Design an enzyme around this catalytic site. Structure first.
Site, PDB file in Angstrom:
ATOM      1  CD  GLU A 131      42.700  42.390  42.496  1.00 46.92           C
ATOM      2  OE1 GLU A 131      43.459  41.450  42.830  1.00 46.92           O
ATOM      3  OE2 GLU A 131      41.562  42.295  42.509  1.00 46.92           O
ATOM      4  CG  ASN A 172      39.410  46.401  37.710  1.00 40.94           C
ATOM      5  OD1 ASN A 172      38.410  47.370  37.676  1.00 40.94           O
ATOM      6  ND2 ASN A 172      39.367  45.154  37.997  1.00 40.94           N
ATOM      7  CG  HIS A 208      35.470  43.559  45.729  1.00 41.14           C
ATOM      8  ND1 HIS A 208      34.554  42.550  45.432  1.00 41.14           N
ATOM      9  CD2 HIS A 208      36.273  43.534  44.857  1.00 41.14           C
ATOM     10  CE1 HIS A 208      34.862  41.982  44.344  1.00 41.14           C
ATOM     11  NE2 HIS A 208      35.984  42.538  44.018  1.00 41.14           N
ATOM     12  CD  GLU A 238      36.815  42.611  40.024  1.00 36.52           C
ATOM     13  OE1 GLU A 238      37.597  43.143  39.339  1.00 36.52           O
ATOM     14  OE2 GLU A 238      36.720  41.650  40.763  1.00 36.52           O
ATOM     15  CG  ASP A 240      31.318  41.843  45.684  1.00 31.45           C
ATOM     16  OD1 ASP A 240      31.851  42.406  46.411  1.00 31.45           O
ATOM     17  OD2 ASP A 240      31.653  40.732  45.173  1.00 31.45           O
TER      18      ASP A 240
HETATM   19  C1  LIG Z   1      37.978  40.951  41.329  1.00 30.57           C
HETATM   20  C2  LIG Z   1      38.896  40.208  40.200  1.00 30.57           C
HETATM   21  O1  LIG Z   1      39.161  41.165  39.146  1.00 30.57           O
HETATM   22  C3  LIG Z   1      38.266  39.177  39.572  1.00 30.57           C
HETATM   23  O2  LIG Z   1      38.950  38.396  38.576  1.00 30.57           O
HETATM   24  C4  LIG Z   1      37.739  37.987  40.627  1.00 30.57           C
HETATM   25  O3  LIG Z   1      37.007  37.161  40.127  1.00 30.57           O
HETATM   26  C5  LIG Z   1      37.257  35.800  40.851  1.00 30.57           C
HETATM   27  O4  LIG Z   1      38.710  35.382  40.646  1.00 30.57           O
HETATM   28  C6  LIG Z   1      38.850  34.200  41.282  1.00 30.57           C
HETATM   29  C7  LIG Z   1      38.083  32.972  40.947  1.00 30.57           C
HETATM   30  O5  LIG Z   1      38.367  31.702  41.567  1.00 30.57           O
HETATM   31  C8  LIG Z   1      36.548  33.250  40.912  1.00 30.57           C
HETATM   32  O6  LIG Z   1      35.591  32.538  40.221  1.00 30.57           O
HETATM   33  C9  LIG Z   1      36.314  34.629  40.342  1.00 30.57           C
HETATM   34  O7  LIG Z   1      35.129  35.215  40.593  1.00 30.57           O
HETATM   35  C10 LIG Z   1      37.158  38.654  41.741  1.00 30.57           C
HETATM   36  C11 LIG Z   1      37.764  40.062  42.147  1.00 30.57           C
HETATM   37  O8  LIG Z   1      39.099  39.423  43.046  1.00 30.57           O
END
Ligand SMILES: *[C@@H]1[C@H](O)[C@@H](O)[C@H](O[C@@H]2OC[C@@H](O)[C@H](O)[C@H]2O)C[C@H]1O
Ligand SMILES: *[C@@H]1O[C@H](CO)[C@@H](O)[C@H](O)[C@H]1NC(C)=O
Ligand SMILES: *[C@@H]1O[C@H](CO)[C@@H](O)[C@H](O)[C@H]1NC(C)=O
Ligand SMILES: [K+]
Length: 321
Positions: A131, A172, A208, A238, A240
């Site tokens: 990101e 990513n 997403h 990822e 959904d």
């Molecule tokens: C993509 C990102 O790369 C991934 O790391 C995110 O996962 C979430 O990060 C925040 C955390 O609180 C959650 O449990 C976890 O699923 C999802 C997305 O941003």
């Protein structure tokens, strides 16, 4: 046939899922996580992030990440290691440090060297840089970008490649599936790393979406080909498809068509290697705590029962159900 069996039959490496440590005491959950007919690949959701692995400068803690890595090896599942450099889930010694370009560069290389060396030979892929872009394709502000500048990106890729030469190294990001300014900026990051002489193997498209905003299969294929033309692999990382609650038969059917188009685009693209969903059951989805009023984003409901989207994914991999 299950999702991974269907994927391998169409020439993908895997169909897989994220999970997290707190979920592993739910026995009916873990019984289905261990079902290799459906899942040939695992991503650790949280326990390989910087706050989880280096909670104080120079002290490393791998117990929780190792639990996920050992489960994948125990089942014969591929591991996507996630993630080394990101604005989110940093410890306060990083975000609140008194840094120079020189001292933060050293601390970034030390973090990557220790974590990648620990998991050496276990990781099919690493998400090295996560990101790095704003919605308009400018660089996202974070402590790495304001102290090191854009060099932080090729520095991270070169540090990961020296510590584990066998891992495929991915950039990513989300919303690249629409093409336009953000996708063009992700191509420019690939070219930045090649221009610096550093190794990059992959681009991860997170996939997403909100239900009804996924474009045609042929549109998705055109965007994936724009990356495979650079000589990198791609994967959906990822995935959904979130619904504004409550669900209806109409939005569950649109969710199925949306997941069907996404997996078909990967089947049709040479160099798209696999498909990961961000967990597999609505019971443990990150969506409700992030997207206010949205949920039911995954192919199994909160009772661990298959939704219409499970058969949509099978239809996108050429199976009659
Ligand atoms: C993509 C990102 O790369 C991934 O790391 C995110 O996962 C979430 O990060 C925040 C955390 O609180 C959650 O449990 C976890 O699923 C999802 C997305 O941003
Ligand atoms: C799931 O698989 C892992 C690794 O093979 C194993 O440690 C665990 O006990 C299994 N759990 C269940 C409930 O099948
Ligand atoms: C930090 O150092 C590296 C190596 O000299 C360089 O590429 C980068 O441009 C520097 N950044 C800043 C903002 O001083
Ligand atoms: K493919």
């Amino acid at each position: 046939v299950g999702l991974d069996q269907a994927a391998v039959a169409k020439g993908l490496q895997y169909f897989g899922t994220a999970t997290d440590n707190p979920e592993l005491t739910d026995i009916p959950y873990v019984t289905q996580l261990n079902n290799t007919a459906d899942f040939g690949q695992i991503t650790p959701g949280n326990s390989m992030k910087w706050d989880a692995t280096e909670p104080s400068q120079g002290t490393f803690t791998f117990t929780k990440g190792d639990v996920i890595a050992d489960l994948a090896e125990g089942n014969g599942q591929y591991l996507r290691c996630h993630t080394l450099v990101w604005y989110n889930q940093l410890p306060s010694w990083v975000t609140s440090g008194t840094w120079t370009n020189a001292t933060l560069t050293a601390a970034l290389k030390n973090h990557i060297t220790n974590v990648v060396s620990h998991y050496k030979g276990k990781c099919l892929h690493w998400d090295v840089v996560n990101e790095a872009l704003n919605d308009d394709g400018t660089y996202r502000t974070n402590i790495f970008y304001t102290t090191i500048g854009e060099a932080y990106i090729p520095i991270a890729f070169a540090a990961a490649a020296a510590a584990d030469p066998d891992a495929k190294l991915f950039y990513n990001d989300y919303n690249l599936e629409y093409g336009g300014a953000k996708a063009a900026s992700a191509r420019a990051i690939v070219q930045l790393v090649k221009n610096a002489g550093a190794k990059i193997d992959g681009v991860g498209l997170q996939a997403h979406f909100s239900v009804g905003t996924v474009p045609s299969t042929s549109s998705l294929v055109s965007v994936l080909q724009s990356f495979t033309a650079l000589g990198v692999e791609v994967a959906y990382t990822e995935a959904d498809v979130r619904i504004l609650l409550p669900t209806t038969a109409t939005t569950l059917a649109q969710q199925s068509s949306d997941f069907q188009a996404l997996v078909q685009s990967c089947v049709q693209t040479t160099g798209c290697v696999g498909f990961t969903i961000w967990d597999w059951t609505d019971k443990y989805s990150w969506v409700p705590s992030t997207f206010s009023g949205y949920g039911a984003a995954l192919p199994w409901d909160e009772n661990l029962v298959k939704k219409p989207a499970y058969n949509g994914l099978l239809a996108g991999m050429g199976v009659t159900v």
